[PDB]
Amino acid sequence: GGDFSDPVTSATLSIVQVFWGLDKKLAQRKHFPSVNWLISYSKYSTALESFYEQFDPDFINIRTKAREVLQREDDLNEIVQLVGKDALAEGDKITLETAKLLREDYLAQNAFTPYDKFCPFYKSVWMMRNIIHFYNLANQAVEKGAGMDGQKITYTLIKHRLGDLFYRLVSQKFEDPAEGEPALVAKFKKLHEDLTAGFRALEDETR
């Protein structure tokens, strides 16, 4: 709540490499992790490059895409507050949908429930991969915009026609890690395959 220019804070941020800046607004929003995704930073990123590469090479790019989506949402929040959502385009619409999906499914961890008490890295990477893949598929779909349709029409269609995948992306959080890593990996791979089937049949129908 206090200013982050306090001498103790300034001294710490000079030497500390990772600041997990909690947000008073998030705490009031009852968002339990309460970690701000804008002020916080981890300078150790470059060191873990080899670890992330050996674990999952695609994780870096999807993490960067998630960061860009979050930054865009935070940037245009002021615009939508001032101008209004009327001028928002299909790309803006899918960006906001993905941002809300992150804020709800991903950054929120209750930790008072067995499914949310502990989130292993394999489950976290799969959830982020699913969200980013859905974002990419929506981008490609609205970019196609052909056949006397598409773009915002495609966005609304995939919102309604593909609403089941969007809804169960939220439930992907509720997947219990205790069931075992192979089972969770299989379930997430099946979800990814279904998501690929989505926006492909929607591509075939050409709106």
Partner 1 sequence: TQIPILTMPNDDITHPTPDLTGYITEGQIYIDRQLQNRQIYPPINVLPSLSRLMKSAIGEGMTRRDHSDVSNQLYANYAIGKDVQAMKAVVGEEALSSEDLLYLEFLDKFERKFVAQGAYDSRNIFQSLDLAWTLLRIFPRELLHRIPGKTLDQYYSR
Partner 2 sequence: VVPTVTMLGVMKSRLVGATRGHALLKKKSDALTVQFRQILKNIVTTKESMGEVMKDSSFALIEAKYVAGENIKHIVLENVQNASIKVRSRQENIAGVKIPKFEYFTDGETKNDLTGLARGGQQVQQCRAAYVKAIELLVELASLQTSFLTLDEAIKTTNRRVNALENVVKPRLENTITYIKGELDELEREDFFRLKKIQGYKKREIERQLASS
| Binding residues for partner 2 (CB under 8 A) | 2-3, 5, 78-79, 82-83, 86-87
What's the Cα-to-Cα distance from 119 to each of 72, 104, 174, 181, rounded to whole Å?
Answer: 26, 15, 11, 11
Q: Which is nearer to partner 2, 3 or 204 (CB)?
A: 3
Q: Coil, strand or helix: which one is 108?
A: coil
Which listed option, partner 2, partner 1, none, makes contact with residue 2 (CB within 5 to 8 Å by class)? Answer: partner 2
CA–CA separation, 17 and 112 (whole Å): 29
Segment near partner 1 (CB under 8 A); pick from 63-71, 102-110, 121-129, 169-177: 63-71
Q: Which is nearer to partner 1, 28 or 46 (CB)?
A: 46
What's the Cα-to-Cα distance from 136 to each of 8, 59, 95, 179, 207, rounded to whole Å?
Answer: 43, 15, 10, 29, 18
Residue 12 interacting with partner 1 (CB under 8 A): no
CA–CA separation, 90 and 79 (whole Å): 16
| Minimum CB–partner distance for residue 3 and partner 2 (Å) | 4
Q: Which is nearer to partner 2, 5 or 28 (CB)?
A: 5
Residue 71 interacting with partner 1 (CB under 8 A): yes
Which listed option, partner 1, partner 2, none, makes contact with residue 24 (CB within 5 to 8 Å by class)? Answer: none
CA–CA separation, 77 and 196 (whole Å): 30
Q: Which is nearer to partner 1, 64 or 110 (CB)?
A: 64
Alpha helices in the chain (DSSP H): 7-15, 24-28, 49-55, 59-82, 90-101, 114-117, 121-144, 152-161, 163-171, 181-197, 201-205
Q: Coil, strand or helix: which one is 5?
A: coil
| Minimum CB–partner distance for residue 91 and partner 2 (Å) | 16
| Minimum CB–partner distance for residue 105 and partner 1 (Å) | 21
Residues that bind partner 1 (CB under 8 A): 4-5, 10, 14, 38, 64, 67-68, 71, 75-76, 79, 83, 86-89
